[PDB]
Write a protein that binds this DNA or RNA. Structure first.
Ligand SMILES: [K+]
Ligand SMILES: [K+]
Ligand SMILES: [K+]
Ligand SMILES: [K+]
Ligand SMILES: [K+]
Ligand SMILES: [K+]
Ligand SMILES: [Mg+2]
Ligand SMILES: [Mg+2]
Ligand SMILES: [Mg+2]
Ligand SMILES: [Mg+2]
Ligand SMILES: [Mg+2]
Ligand SMILES: [Mg+2]
Ligand SMILES: [Mg+2]
Ligand SMILES: [Mg+2]
Ligand SMILES: [Mg+2]
Ligand SMILES: [Mg+2]
Ligand SMILES: [Mg+2]
Ligand SMILES: [Mg+2]
Ligand SMILES: [Mg+2]
Ligand SMILES: [Mg+2]
Ligand SMILES: [Mg+2]
Ligand SMILES: [Mg+2]
Ligand SMILES: [Mg+2]
Ligand SMILES: [Mg+2]
Ligand SMILES: [Mg+2]
Ligand SMILES: [Mg+2]
Ligand SMILES: [Mg+2]
Ligand SMILES: [Mg+2]
Ligand SMILES: [Mg+2]
Ligand SMILES: [Mg+2]
Ligand SMILES: [Mg+2]
Ligand SMILES: [Mg+2]
Ligand SMILES: [Mg+2]
Ligand SMILES: [Mg+2]
Ligand SMILES: [Mg+2]
Ligand SMILES: [Mg+2]
Ligand SMILES: [Mg+2]
Ligand SMILES: [Mg+2]
Ligand SMILES: [Mg+2]
Ligand SMILES: [Mg+2]
Ligand SMILES: [Mg+2]
Ligand SMILES: [Mg+2]
Ligand SMILES: [Mg+2]
Ligand SMILES: [Mg+2]
Lengths: 182, 260, 182, 72
RNA sequence: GGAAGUCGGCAAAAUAGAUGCGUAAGUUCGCAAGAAGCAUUGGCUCUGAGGGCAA
RNA sequence: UGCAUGCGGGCGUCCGUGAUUUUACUGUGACUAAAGAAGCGUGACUAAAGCAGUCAUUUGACUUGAAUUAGAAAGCAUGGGAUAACAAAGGAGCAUUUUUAAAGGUUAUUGGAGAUUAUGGAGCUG
RNA sequence: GAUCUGGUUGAUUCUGCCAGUAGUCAUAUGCUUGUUUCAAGGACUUAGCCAUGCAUGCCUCAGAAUCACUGCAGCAGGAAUCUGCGCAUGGCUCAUUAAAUCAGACGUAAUCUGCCGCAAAAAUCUUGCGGCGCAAAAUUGGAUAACUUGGCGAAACGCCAAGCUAAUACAUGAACCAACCGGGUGUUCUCCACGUGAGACGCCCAGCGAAUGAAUGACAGUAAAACCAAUGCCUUGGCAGUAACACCCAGCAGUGUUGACUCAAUUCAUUCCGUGCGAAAGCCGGCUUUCCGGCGUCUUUUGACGAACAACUGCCCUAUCAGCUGGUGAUGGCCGUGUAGUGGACUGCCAUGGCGUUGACGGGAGCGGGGGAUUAGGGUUCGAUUCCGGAGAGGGAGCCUGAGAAAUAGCUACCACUUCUACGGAGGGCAGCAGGCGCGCAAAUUGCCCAAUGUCAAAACAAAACGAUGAGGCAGCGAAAAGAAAUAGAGUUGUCUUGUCAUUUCAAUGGGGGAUAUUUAAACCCAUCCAAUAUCGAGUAACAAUUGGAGGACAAGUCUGGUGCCAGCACCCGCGGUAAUUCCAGCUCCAAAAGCGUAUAUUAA
């Protein structure tokens, strides 16, 4: 009562629950990017649908429309900043060509694996959730963290991590305590 | 009747966060309208940051440390409004409540010898007992012998000390004007013409410094000078010129990148 | 109690309004004064805003004006002789606004004598002559003054202000009520 | 409005005809409103005449307007 | 108290004038209907309304 | 406190007289509480959020930010007049100007103010 | 993502529904839940009934203390009580309600308006002493609480009598200092006249507000002269001028506002009772008829906060609802009454109006929006519920006080229900917060706190010295809903490039246990850490994921047992009568996943 903290959904279920083409394609993405559940794909689907819905509305307007100029600039700025689109493509029409792998390639889990800090995408997932990856000296434990292009060079092992410049992990520490007792 | 003011129902210009509380300080009756004022508690706490909460605001205000129009105001629900001079002599603060070009309250720092001067717009003229002419201003002042040339809509230049009128600015074409209501609140332009509609709202057509045309109702304008160059008051940073939204966004992005 | 609201009234369509609130103090009415001739009896009424209305139950004298002379005098009310609302108000000697009453004519005769020097200091003699020059008096008014009773119209509201002021009938209005009083 | 009835004393009924737009069907309806208007004896309007009416204080149960001008 | 009387409310009791509201099933639409019911009535002193004939 | 006063046309302000044109539509503009919906900016670890905050790193900057929108119909001002609407008429049911002179029949100005007069303007006819 | 699929036939092509499908801050129910963030939460049915407790009080330097109150030695603090303000806000709920309420847009010149802002104020023969005179910083009066005494009563948010004493309670009352202005007058007196005369002096009145009359509250389409009485001038007969005005004021309003006014305001006459008007006859501070400041109050006035009224356009279904209104108001008129004010709001009289198929009247379901869901678009649907508006406090009515109530943790009465009692009598109103009981498919703690947000108020905070607040906040409960996110990761060798299987080796991390601590009003969560000299912990990582399915729609078995048109499944088509792709099981597989089914509504389809 009298609480005005807003909240909204970030994903939707597919209209057809059992479509073999969609099931196989989503199984490919889950295995390829190490996703926990289909909800992560559907969250990406909603993000894309909102971006394309915005783009389609703007592309309807005349090219000199002030709203198209302002929001079209913002949409392109966001896509370039987060790495969804390359800097070569600057027209609003290229937002409509974005696909699910484009966003999934920008997740911290994929970026960590591609950067060589992890042997696999599954190794990357556990490294992130175990407080081993830092973006600009900030520990990030969210696999779905979308990495900006500017922050991509600042990804490394956390200074407080055993793999960075921190103390030894649990198994080494417990082994040392057992050795001291023994 | 009504003693409370829900924070959602409070004016948005007060910059009160919806999650901080259910209520807002309800302005008392006074110089300014409830919808067109800024209560002292908001000024001393949410804007000047001198008080961290309402308890400290009461400490400051009920001591008489805050002067409005050269008078100690001990009520945090006192409605301060447009052209009011706020002084805190112990900290050397002197502000005038103005509207920025976005229609929000701005605290314009005042020097000495100009915090003594307040511009008041004449809203009504009448005759009191003994056949004395009285001019009622936008801030509730009643002046018992104004300039004989004073008309409704004119601005009286007033000295808060000595309680004396010092000048009169008439509401005519070509005069500098600031808008105190509507979508154009805070903008400054010259009166190119006034469209008169008897029994209804008169329309004033204005032209800012850049040459852009805009219009408001005649009740929303406030004569502030002979011309745009000669203003009798000190205005905020934007000088009343509304920048293009797209141009403003690009400039802010460039400035942010420059600091980075 | 007594209500001045329109809720109980039929709509212009003849419909019965379904009242869905209780009676309010703001829409109240009160019983009439029914002021009658007699020794002055007055009852205050605390009205809205804390102000007082003077409900006159009985009145005997009043401040009556001679319009053509721009003067007034406090004279005694002799009888009420006509009432445009009902004959039963004349019969009960009820004083309301616009009812025709007979008032004492002695003060008006005295003022006329002392102002114009006419019965119905040499400087005052010249003053009388100057006042008479352009002055003319209606014969109907003068005839009534000689008789001792003049007809006047009540111009105040006794049930509101508690006083019965009035104005002497002159000209066409005097002839109108003289016809309706034979 | 246009004078509709002059049967009362010093009072007339005028009718204001207008088109109301129905959004769903993108079309209009013909609608009317009837007003009781006090008519001063300075005017002698007949049924079908167009008049200009101004808002005044409540003069009766239904009268809120006064005739200001008559156009034949 | 109120039909327990008696074959049976027989006999008696009861209702009543005028005026204003109001009046159900059914009906051949005419009625049913004075349906049923609910109110008011005196005396006195007044006030309105309802006309004729002349100039 | 005379301490005062001076070195032919077009405006804009208010009155008085003089034949009358709106509305729908469309473009601009006003006037329109928030919350909610779009949306700018912002690595609250991300996000749902929030309107915060950011940067120097000696006591403070950013004369910090919190932009903009949409919101039914109806009401308000103004521009356009194609398509339409409302009203009127029903066509004999109808309608010249300008010079001049002469004839007739309760205004300023006379130093105010109160009568009285006459003189002309100006209209009214011929 | 502007989408469809199964079932009518021996096959075909249609129409057409049934069924399937996705969402819902839509609820309920079942099964299952390791973290973490954010949240709805007795609306639906019974505006049903309620035990108990708490929800509105307020004191500064600055209204009134002689507590027979406490410290110090008159100074402080001061329980009670009178006085002043508030309790008409907030909170709750959605029963009533369709020319109503409400929304946007207007109006009140038809009105009221405490607290708050800016202002205004010259009426009002009072006091002391003496005997009308003399003087002046006005040294005013009577009560009543608390308290004491006696008490009454079973009690009662029940009472009586007597005795004390306060005021910013109540009442009374202030001359001169102290002005300007105007109207009546006198058989007053001085002058000029030979009276539209001029002066004084005397006398009645002349303040704000209110009442009734009378004026003003402007002008804004014609130029010239003559004569008469009064009168201004220049001059000693004229008309050059020229604000106005018979001094003491030679300019001390010839000029309010609006679109509009019978309004503002001014002048004249008369009136003003108690139902108006103190410099509260007030209280505190500093510097010392000492004068400076602070705030407190009466009255007048207009801004502000409001209140009340009016209504331009709009607002569901229903004709198996077609007429409605008008004794006793329906539509309009007149004079009144009443109101704060307009008004058929109401008395009297008058006239027949007024509304309705463009749906009146009646009936049905509904609080109204802002907004929610769903949505290519158009639409459909929900809105008891945070904000705004309205309305109510068991059901009706009525009312006092007050600026504001037709108030309900105010009063009065009746009805229903109900509590205490000593039988004579006295009480009650949770649709406030917790809690019960019922009702139901259906909805939490008789918790902590005023730390924040506000409200009230004699009030900044502090100092012997902490205002109240179930508004509100914080926790508990809470898979309504929303966000993030664990249940493992890297290899080794062997076996059957990748990929299975066994074992076999490394690290890592939380769930959890704790803390020098942090947070917090205090706690609790979340964050930080497992030495900084110095700090616990996974291998079956038993720290063990579920919910539905496997003929088709629709992803996934022609598997193995059992049953044998039985049991049962099956939203629909259908399966089951001994070799069941469908039941009951096992295994394996499929879908979603800390979630997944079911029912009922609703949107799409
Ligand atoms: K004290
Ligand atoms: K309406
Ligand atoms: K008057
Ligand atoms: K009337
Ligand atoms: K508090
Ligand atoms: K089998
Ligand atoms: Mg107006
Ligand atoms: Mg007679
Ligand atoms: Mg009987
Ligand atoms: Mg028998
Ligand atoms: Mg027998
Ligand atoms: Mg018989
Ligand atoms: Mg019948
Ligand atoms: Mg019968
Ligand atoms: Mg009968
Ligand atoms: Mg928002
Ligand atoms: Mg067939
Ligand atoms: Mg078949
Ligand atoms: Mg066959
Ligand atoms: Mg944890
Ligand atoms: Mg925990
Ligand atoms: Mg009291
Ligand atoms: Mg209340
Ligand atoms: Mg309330
Ligand atoms: Mg006085
Ligand atoms: Mg007044
Ligand atoms: Mg009829
Ligand atoms: Mg009236
Ligand atoms: Mg929602
Ligand atoms: Mg609602
Ligand atoms: Mg309900
Ligand atoms: Mg609730
Ligand atoms: Mg109520
Ligand atoms: Mg009540
Ligand atoms: Mg209660
Ligand atoms: Mg009750
Ligand atoms: Mg409760
Ligand atoms: Mg539940
Ligand atoms: Mg609460
Ligand atoms: Mg832990
Ligand atoms: Mg917490
Ligand atoms: Mg299949
Ligand atoms: Mg078998
Ligand atoms: Mg969960």
């Amino acid at each position: 009562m009298r609480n005005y903290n807003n909240f909204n959904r970030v994903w939707k279920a597919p209209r057809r629950p059992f479509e073999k083409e969609r099931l196989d394609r989503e199984m490919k993405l889950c295995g390829q990017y190490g996703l926990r559940c289909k909800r992560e794909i559907w969250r990406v689907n909603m993000t894309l649908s909102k971006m394309r819905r915005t783009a389609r509305l703007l592309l309807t307007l005349p090219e000199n429309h002030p709203r198209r100029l302002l929001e079209g600039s913002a949409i392109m700025r966001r896509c370039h900043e987060y790495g969804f689109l390359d800097e070569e493509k600057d027209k609003l029409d290229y937002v409509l060509s974005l696909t699910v792998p484009d966003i999934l390639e920008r997740r911290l889990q994929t970026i960590v694996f591609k950067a060589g800090l992890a042997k696999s995408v599954h190794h990357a997932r556990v490294l992130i959730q175990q407080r081993h990856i830092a973006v600009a000296k900030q520990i990030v434990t969210i696999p779905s963290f979308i990495v900006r292009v500017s922050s991509e060079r600042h990804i490394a092992f956390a200074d407080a991590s055993p793999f960075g410049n921190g103390r030894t992990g649990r198994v080494k520490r417990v082994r040392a305590k057992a050795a001291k007792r023994h | 009747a009504k003693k409370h003011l829900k924070r959602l129902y409070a004016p948005k210009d007060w910059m009160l966060s919806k999650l901080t509380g259910v209520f807002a300080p309800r302005p008392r009756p006074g110089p300014h309208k409830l919808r067109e004022c800024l209560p002292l508690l908001v000024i001393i706490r949410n804007r000047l940051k001198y008080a961290l909460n309402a308890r400290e605001g009461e400490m400051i205000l009920r001591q008489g440390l805050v002067h409005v129009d050269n008078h100690p105001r001990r009520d945090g629900k006192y409605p301060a409004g447009f052209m009011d001079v706020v002084e805190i002599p112990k900290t050397g603060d002197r502000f005038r409540l103005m509207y920025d070009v976005k229609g929000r309250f701005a605290l314009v720092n005042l020097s000495e010898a100009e915090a003594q001067i307040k511009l008041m717009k004449v809203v009504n003229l009448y005759t009191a007992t003994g056949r004395v002419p009285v001019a009622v201003t936008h801030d509730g002042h009643r002046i018992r012998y104004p300039d004989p040339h004073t008309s409704i809509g004119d601005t009286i230049v007033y000295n808060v000390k000595e309680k004396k009128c010092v000048d009169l600015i008439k509401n005519r074409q070509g005069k500098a004007v600031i808008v105190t209501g509507g979508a154009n609140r805070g903008r400054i332009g010259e009166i190119v013409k006034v469209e008169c509609h008897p029994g209804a709202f008169n329309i004033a057509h204005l032209k800012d410094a850049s040459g852009a045309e805009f219009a408001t109702r005649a009740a929303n304008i406030f004569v502030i000078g002979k011309d745009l160059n000669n203003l009798q008051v000190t205005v905020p940073k934007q000088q009343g010129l509304r920048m293009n939204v797209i141009q403003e966004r690009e400039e802010r992005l460039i400035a942010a990148e420059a600091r980075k | 109690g007594i209500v001045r609201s329109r809720l109980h009234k039929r709509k212009i369509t003849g419909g019965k309004t379904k009242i869905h609130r209780k009676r309010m103090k703001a829409e109240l009415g009160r019983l009439p004064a029914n002021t009658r001739l007699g020794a002055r009896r007055v009852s205050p009424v605390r009205a809205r805003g804390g102000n007082f209305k003077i409900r006159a139950l009985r009145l005997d004298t009043g401040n009556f004006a001679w319009a053509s002379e721009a003067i007034a005098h406090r004279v005694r009310l002799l009888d009420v002789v006509y009432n445009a609302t009902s004959n039963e108000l004349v019969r009960t000697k009820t004083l309301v606004k616009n009812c025709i009453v007979a008032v004492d004519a002695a003060p008006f005769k005295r003022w006329y004598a002392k102002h114009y020097g006419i019965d119905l200091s040499p400087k005052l003699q010249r003053e009388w002559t100057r006042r008479r020059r352009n002055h003319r008096v209606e014969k109907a008014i003068a005839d009534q003054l000689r008789e001792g009773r003049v007809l006047a119209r009540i111009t105040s509201r006794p049930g509101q202000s508690g006083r019965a002021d009035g104005i002497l009938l002159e000209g066409a209005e005097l002839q109108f009520y003289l016809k309706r009083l034979e | 409005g246009v004078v509709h009835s002059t049967k009362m004393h010093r009072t007339i009924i005028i009718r204001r005809n207008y088109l109301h737009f129905i959004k769903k069907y993108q079309r209009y309806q013909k609608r009317h409103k009837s007003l009781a208007v006090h008519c001063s004896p300075a005017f002698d309007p007949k049924q079908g005449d167009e008049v200009v009416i101004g808002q005044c204080r409540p003069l009766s149960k239904t009268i809120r307007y006064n005739v200001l001008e008559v156009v034949s």
